[PDB]
Amino acid sequence: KNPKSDKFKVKRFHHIEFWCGDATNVARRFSWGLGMRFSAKSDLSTGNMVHASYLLTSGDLRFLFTAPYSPSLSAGEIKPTTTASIPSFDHGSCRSFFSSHGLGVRAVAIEVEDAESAFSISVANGAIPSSPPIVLNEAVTIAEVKLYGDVVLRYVSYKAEFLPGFERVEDASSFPLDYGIRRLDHAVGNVPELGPALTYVAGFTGFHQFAEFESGLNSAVLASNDEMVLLPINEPVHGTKRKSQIQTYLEHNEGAGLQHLALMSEDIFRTLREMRKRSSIGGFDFMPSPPPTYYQNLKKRVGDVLSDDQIKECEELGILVDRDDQGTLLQIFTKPLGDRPTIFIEIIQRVGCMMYQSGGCGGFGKGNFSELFKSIEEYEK
Amino acid sequence: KNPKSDKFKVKRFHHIEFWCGDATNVARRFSWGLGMRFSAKSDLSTGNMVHASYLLTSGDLRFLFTAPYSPSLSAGEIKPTTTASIPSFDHGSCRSFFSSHGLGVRAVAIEVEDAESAFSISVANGAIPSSPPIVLNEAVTIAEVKLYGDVVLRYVSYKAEFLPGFERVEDASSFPLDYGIRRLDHAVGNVPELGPALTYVAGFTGFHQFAEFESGLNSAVLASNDEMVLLPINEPVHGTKRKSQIQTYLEHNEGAGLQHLALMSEDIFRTLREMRKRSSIGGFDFMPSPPPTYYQNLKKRVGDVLSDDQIKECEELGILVDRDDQGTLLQIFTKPLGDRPTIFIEIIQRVGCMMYQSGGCGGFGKGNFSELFKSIEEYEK
Ligand SMILES: Cc1c(C(=O)C2=C(O)CCCC2=O)ccc2c1c(=O)n(CC(=O)NCCOc1ccc3ccc4cccc5ccc1c3c45)c(=O)n2C
Numbered sequence: 001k002n003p004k005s006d007k008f009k010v011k012r013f014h015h016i017e018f019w020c021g022d023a024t025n026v027a028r029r030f031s032w033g034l035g036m037r038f039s040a041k042s043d044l045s046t047g048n049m050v051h052a053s054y055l056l057t058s059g060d061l062r063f064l065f066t067a068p069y070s071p072s073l074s075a076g077e078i079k080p081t082t083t084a085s086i087p088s089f090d091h092g093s094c095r096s097f098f099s100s101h102g103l104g105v106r107a108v109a110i111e112v113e114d115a116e117s118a119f120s121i122s123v124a125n126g127a128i129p130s131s132p133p134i135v136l137n138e139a140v141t142i143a144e145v146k147l148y149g150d151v152v153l154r155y156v157s158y159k160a161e162f163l164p165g166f167e168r169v170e171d172a173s174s175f176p177l178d179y180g181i182r183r184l185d186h187a188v189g190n191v192p193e194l195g196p197a198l199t200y201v202a203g204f205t206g207f208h209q210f211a212e213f214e215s216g217l218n219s220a221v222l223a224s225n226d227e228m229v230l231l232p233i234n235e236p237v238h239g240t241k242r243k244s245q246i247q248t249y250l251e252h253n254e255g256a257g258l259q260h261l262a263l264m265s266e267d268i269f270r271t272l273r274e275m276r277k278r279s280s281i282g283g284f285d286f287m288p289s290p291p292p293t294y295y296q297n298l299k300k301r302v303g304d305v306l307s308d309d310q311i312k313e314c315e316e317l318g319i320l321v322d323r324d325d326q327g328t329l330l331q332i333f334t335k336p337l338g339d340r341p342t343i344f345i346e347i348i349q350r351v352g353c354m355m356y357q358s359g360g361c362g363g364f365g366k367g368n369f370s371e372l373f374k375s376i377e378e379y380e381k
Numbered sequence: 382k383n384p385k386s387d388k389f390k391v392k393r394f395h396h397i398e399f400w401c402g403d404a405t406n407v408a409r410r411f412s413w414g415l416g417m418r419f420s421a422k423s424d425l426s427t428g429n430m431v432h433a434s435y436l437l438t439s440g441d442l443r444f445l446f447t448a449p450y451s452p453s454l455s456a457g458e459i460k461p462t463t464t465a466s467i468p469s470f471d472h473g474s475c476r477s478f479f480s481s482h483g484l485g486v487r488a489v490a491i492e493v494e495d496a497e498s499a500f501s502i503s504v505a506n507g508a509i510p511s512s513p514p515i516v517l518n519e520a521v522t523i524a525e526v527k528l529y530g531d532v533v534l535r536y537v538s539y540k541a542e543f544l545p546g547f548e549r550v551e552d553a554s555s556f557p558l559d560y561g562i563r564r565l566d567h568a569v570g571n572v573p574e575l576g577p578a579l580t581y582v583a584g585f586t587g588f589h590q591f592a593e594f595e596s597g598l599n600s601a602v603l604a605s606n607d608e609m610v611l612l613p614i615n616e617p618v619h620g621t622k623r624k625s626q627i628q629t630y631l632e633h634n635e636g637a638g639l640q641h642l643a644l645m646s647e648d649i650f651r652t653l654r655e656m657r658k659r660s661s662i663g664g665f666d667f668m669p670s671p672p673p674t675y676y677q678n679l680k681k682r683v684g685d686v687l688s689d690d691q692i693k694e695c696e697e698l699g700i701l702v703d704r705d706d707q708g709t710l711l712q713i714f715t716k717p718l719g720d721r722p723t724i725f726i727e728i729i730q731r732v733g734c735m736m737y738q739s740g741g742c743g744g745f746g747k748g749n750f751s752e753l754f755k756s757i758e759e760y761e762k
């Protein structure tokens with residue numbers, strides 16, 4: 001059931017912004033590890049005396065990395081005279097965020113029809129305002145409300161090229177890396193209490209609960225009208241034999257925040273071949289692979305969707321498989337992206353639900369918690 | 382002239398420590414960009430609840446990257462019960478350093494015969510103490526005094542494997558990258574006033590002024606007895622037509638600090654081939670290459686040291702060449718390592734002064750300021 005109750009017109013995920021200590025080093029690491037091209041910049045070389053911001057792209061996926069300069073460079077500016085390209089940026093907020101949480105996502109940005117109306121409707125329906133609508137070069141409007149923790153939901157709307165004041169990157173510095181990643185599928189938050197978090201976000205967005213089918217968590221998914229903006233939220237389950245990874249997250253993150261980004265690949269086999277080649281030479285590491293019993297058990301579960309060879313290809317790459325009533329999910333998880341056991345990445349590809357493919361086809365892999373446990377037991381033997 | 386006036390026995394450069402916001406991302410970027418292997422770690426997985434520290438090595442070059450965890454993880458510890466492997470580490474100091482200066486060098490570490498005596502003699506001779514001698518696992522002693530700005534000179538001495546509490550890295554995560562870099566040749570600081578900085582450091586070390594032969598700077602080099610520890614220091618020259626890069630550094634760094642690290646390569650041609658291949662795929666960028674007139678002028682200057690082909694190889698890679706009365710220097714400079722126009726790297730190789738090669742053979746390339754200017758004028762034509 002989908003009541004299509006969005007209180008304003010939402011289009012697609014637009015970008016994800018990381019708040020960093022040094023944007024250059026994080027952006028270069030991510031570019032190589034994920035196969036994303038340097039696409040745009042806003043920094044001292046573009047006249048921005050406030051923050052350094054570098055944009056990476058792969059298909060429609062946009063990752064923005066931002067760090068503050070010394071406040072002394074902009075000490076004579078006021079908001080009316082700012083050289084910042086992102087007017088919501090604040091030195092103190094950024095330093096406080098990073099000192100509290102370490103490297104992580106500050107903004108989950110969605111494109112909307114009218115960012116001013118989305119902001120107004122959101123706040124009228126309980127959203128805590130974070131940054132008011134600001135019109136950039138009479139061309140783009142940006143506004144921000146609190147999502148959870150210190151993560152904001154950023155609304156962006158365009159009259160008619162990322163943001164004004166950003167410059168396209170010199171193609172000598174823009175190597176055309178591409179490992180197959182194409183868009184953000186979903187963005188997942190960890191909170192201490194799922195109920196109040198769901199009520200708050202669904203309250204100001206009108207997003208509905210997305211249909212699904214002790215492992216340490218309870219979760220639910222909020223979805224826009226066409227179910228292409230997907231925002232799962234997790235809470236810990238306390239008292240388990242194995243400590244909840246959600247609780248570990250909350251401890252090391254100093255509270256609620258974004259847990260993982262799920263990145264859709266148009267060819268998850270190529271993406272994982274390319275990412276795994278680079279794990280130990282600057283890229284990203286992956287979770288330990290499931291035992292071979294897991295891949296023998298795949299024949300009975302998805303043998304009508306994947307051939308034996310395609311199943312063997314999943315086994316070589318450590319890919320997990322889950323199934324809905326409508327489709328099939330291929331997924332895999334990285335180790336944490338930075339020092340703290342907090343944020344990580346998921347690579348996914350979805351099979352089925354052709355109408356275009358409907359959002360969320362095959363679910364989110366919750367069936368893989370039980371399958372992994374069974375598989376671990378069976379391999380013990 | 383070398384009076385050999387060291388007030389304590391100094392051996393060689395031991396390591397360089399960067400203070401980071403996220404050590405993982407900086408270390409992975411540097412590993413790929415410079416061809417350094419992940420060699421050791423001290424972090425949550427080794428029981429360190431205080432800081433994440435990752436060691437990269439290439440030959441005898443040791444780069445350490447350290448970032449603080451949430452203080453909450455160690456809030457019950459005191460110094461007698463600390464799980465930090467580097468007892469001088471302090472959360473507040475590290476966050477303050479990084480917020481003030483951005484990514485940069487906190488510690489220039491030299492190995493000495495006895496770190497406790499070096500500390501005591503240094504402080505008796507004017508050094509400002511930063512961290513007192515602490516004996517680690519009855520095996521290593523570490524002590525720190527102020528060098529310039531918020532950079533410390535760290536003394537390390539060994540009774541008889543980096544530091545106790547560090548663990549060797551799993552060789553699955555330890556890819557054997559190597560682009561030819563072999564050791565730290567020199568480490569250069571920028572200060573507002575050269576005179577007082579020289580008097581202070583030479584005062585507590587006994588290091589002597591190393592012999593040499595308007596560009597925006599005055600410089601001098603302090604050297605240990607065998608001239609293998611080399612510490613140049615720069616001050617700006619004000620009022621020049623082109624603003625001093627030293628003054629720009631001081632402004633963007635919020636004061637004095639480490640300007641560049643010069644890394645000796647055993648094969649600078651291979652090192653630059655490998656580094657330039659990776660510049661736009663996560664590595665380091667290099668300064669703009671000098672015009673071809675510079676390389677035509679090399680025949681008259683070093684045609685007795687480099688063949689035409691070896692000169693052409695310098696031209697393909699953008700390598701600079703300078704000459705002393707004793708030897709020849711091949712050098713090249715990276716663009717800044719992070720967001721701010723502050724710290725950068727120099728790659729060097731020295732030719733001549735065979736006895737082993739004496740320290741500082743061929744100088745530091747000061748002749749290349751004038752040669753570059755002449756070369757730029759000639760290419761204008
Ligand atoms: C995240 C996820 C999903 C998922 O998408 C999802 C949604 O979209 C919405 C619905 C709810 C939900 O779940 C589905 C299936 C998953 C997983 C998943 O995450 N996982 C495994 C894991 O645990 N991944 C994170 C691992 O965390 C850590 C990794 C590495 C470390 C290394 C050293 C460490 C040292 C000290 C403490 C540490 C704590 C946590 C550490 C860690 C520590 C899995 O198996 N399935 C099968």
Ligand SMILES: Cc1c(C(=O)C2=C(O)CCCC2=O)ccc2c1c(=O)n(CC(=O)NCCOc1ccc3ccc4cccc5ccc1c3c45)c(=O)n2C
Nearest residue numbers: 044569600613626629714716717722727745746747749750
């Ligand atoms: C450093 C050095 C040595 C050297 O070893 C040395 C010693 O060992 C001890 C004795 C004193 C000394 O000198 C020798 C020769 C050098 C150089 C050297 O450094 N150079 C060129 C340059 O300038 N390298 C740093 C470039 O800084 C910047 C690079 C890139 C940017 C990009 C964007 C920017 C935007 C805005 C502001 C910026 C400010 C500064 C920016 C910058 C800015 C050179 O040519 N020779 C020839």
Ligand SMILES: [Co+2]
Nearest residue numbers: 188262346364
């Ligand atoms: Co997911």
Ligand SMILES: [Co+2]
Nearest residue numbers: 569643727745
């Ligand atoms: Co130098």
